[PDB]
Amino acid sequence: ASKLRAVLEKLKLSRDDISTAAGMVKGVVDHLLLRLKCDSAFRGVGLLNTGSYYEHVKISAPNEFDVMFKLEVPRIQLEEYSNTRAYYFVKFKRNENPLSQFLEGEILSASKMLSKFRKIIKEEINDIKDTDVIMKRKRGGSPAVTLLISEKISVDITLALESKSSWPASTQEGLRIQNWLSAKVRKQLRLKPFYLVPKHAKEGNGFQEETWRLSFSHIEKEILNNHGKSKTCCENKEEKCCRKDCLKLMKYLLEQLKERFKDKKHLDKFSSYHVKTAFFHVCTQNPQDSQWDRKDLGLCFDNCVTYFLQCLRTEKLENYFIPEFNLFSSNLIDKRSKEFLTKQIEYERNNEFPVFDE
Ligand SMILES: Nc1nc(=O)c2ncn([C@@H]3O[C@@H]4COP(=O)(O)O[C@H]5[C@@H](O)[C@H](n6cnc7c(N)ncnc76)O[C@@H]5COP(=O)(O)O[C@@H]3[C@@H]4O)c2[nH]1
Numbered sequence: 001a002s003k004l005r006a007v008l009e010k011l012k013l014s015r016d017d018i019s020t021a022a023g024m025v026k027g028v029v030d031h032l033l034l035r036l037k038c039d040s041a042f043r044g045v046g047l048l049n050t051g052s053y054y055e056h057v058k059i060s061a062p063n064e065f066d067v068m069f070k071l072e073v074p075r076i077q078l079e080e081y082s083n084t085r086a087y088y089f090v091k092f093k094r095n096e097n098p099l100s101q102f103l104e105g106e107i108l109s110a111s112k113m114l115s116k117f118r119k120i121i122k123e124e125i126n127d128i129k130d131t132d133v134i135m136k137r138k139r140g141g142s143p144a145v146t147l148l149i150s151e152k153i154s155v156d157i158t159l160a161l162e163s164k165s166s167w168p169a170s171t172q173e174g175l176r177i178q179n180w181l182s183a184k185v186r187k188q189l190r191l192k193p194f195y196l197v198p199k200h201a202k203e204g205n206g207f208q209e210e211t212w213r214l215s216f217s218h219i220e221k222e223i224l225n226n227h228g229k230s231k232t233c234c235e236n237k238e239e240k241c242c243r244k245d246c247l248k249l250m251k252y253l254l255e256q257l258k259e260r261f262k263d264k265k266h267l268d269k270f271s272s273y274h275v276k277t278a279f280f281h282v283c284t285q286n287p288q289d290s291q292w293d294r295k296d297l298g299l300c301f302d303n304c305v306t307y308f309l310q311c312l313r314t315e316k317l318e319n320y321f322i323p324e325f326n327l328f329s330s331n332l333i334d335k336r337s338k339e340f341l342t343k344q345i346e347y348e349r350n351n352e353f354p355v356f357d358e
């Protein structure tokens with residue numbers, strides 16, 4: 001526990017780097033919001049509130065940042081890419097929109113949208129003269145256009161259609177927070193927009209470049225900051241839970257494991273979204289603030305680690321919002337690599353976590 005307090009103390013020692021670093025990110029992002037609004041399609045574009053540093057800037061890892069550009073898109077009609085409960089075709093309600101230039105039938109093409117997004121951004125980068133910034137569009141069908149700044153700091157930018165209609169059927173039994181946050185809050189949250197991002201649905205070898213995927217990062221941000229059964233959790237000397245510290249340690253335990261196997265990238269498919277998602281399932285499972293007292297940090301950390309282990313062991317980690325979307329299927333992650341991480345976390349848990357030593 002005091003070993004873990006030590007670990008949290010160290011992480012705090014870099015709270016000011018990711019302060020100044022994030023101020024660069026916010027600075028560049030604003031340049032983009034200007035040029036994109038000039039375009040007719042992306043006219044009503046704006047920043048989505050998903051991050052802690054500077055209100056729109058999310059931190060996934062040290063020196064990795066994350067921004068969502070939301071775009072209001074009236075009259076959405078969804079067609080599920082069937083049996084893949086998170087992936088959707090997108091249609092307008094038949095009568096005209098400016099997004100017209102991206103249709104492929106009755107369908108809004110994701111990659112067609114993504115392509116113009118990119119040329120607009122790549123064009124602003126080829127113009128700015130103060131800083132050296134570059135493009136890194138590399139990874140496997142990601143919706144993220146990724147900028148790199150002064151060879152140190154990297155930003156994921158995501159286009160996000162905003163639908164203000166009722167969440168789709170695949171989320172009906174998701175966001176199971178009624179025991180934790182309340183039936184009341186779940187109705188409030190599920191009244192809020194949802195977002196579609198242009199991560200395409202695989203077709204085996206390639207993709208289906210007209211399919212979007214659901215996102216709820218703004219809900220994730222809210223249930224992280226408004227995290228207690230008590231409405232006054234973490235607001236006074238008497239209600240200090242360790243919920244946020246427990247998510248930080250989990251994210252950090254994954255990053256340290258990832259460095260140790262930097263040789264062959266044996267764990268490269270694991271992700272802080274996996275640790276976050278699993279941490280939400282624990283909160284659902286332990287709903288009371290009494291179950292996250294601050295002086296019980298070591299116990300709470302174990303609770304998080306075992307459920308993660310169990311998720312790796314069972315090859316099942318449900319998306320928090322779409323219960324039939326299994327982030328740990330073999331569609332997505334090989335049997336072999338999940339075995340790998342179970343062995344290394346199991347050992348880490350059984351020996352007071354030597355990965356956190358000096
Ligand atoms: N900035 C950003 N926002 C996204 O929504 C997102 N979705 C994918 N990616 C990247 O595309 C690639 C494809 O991974 P896949 O989608 O098959 O599994 C993903 C994805 O299902 C899930 N995930 C990550 N972010 C989100 C998110 N905001 N909403 C839902 N699921 C997410 O966790 C898995 C690990 O992905 P990452 O390894 O962290 O980055 C992925 C990866 O590079 C994203 N990058």
Ligand SMILES: [Zn+2]
Pocket residue numbers: 227228233234239240241242243
């Ligand atoms: Zn709290």
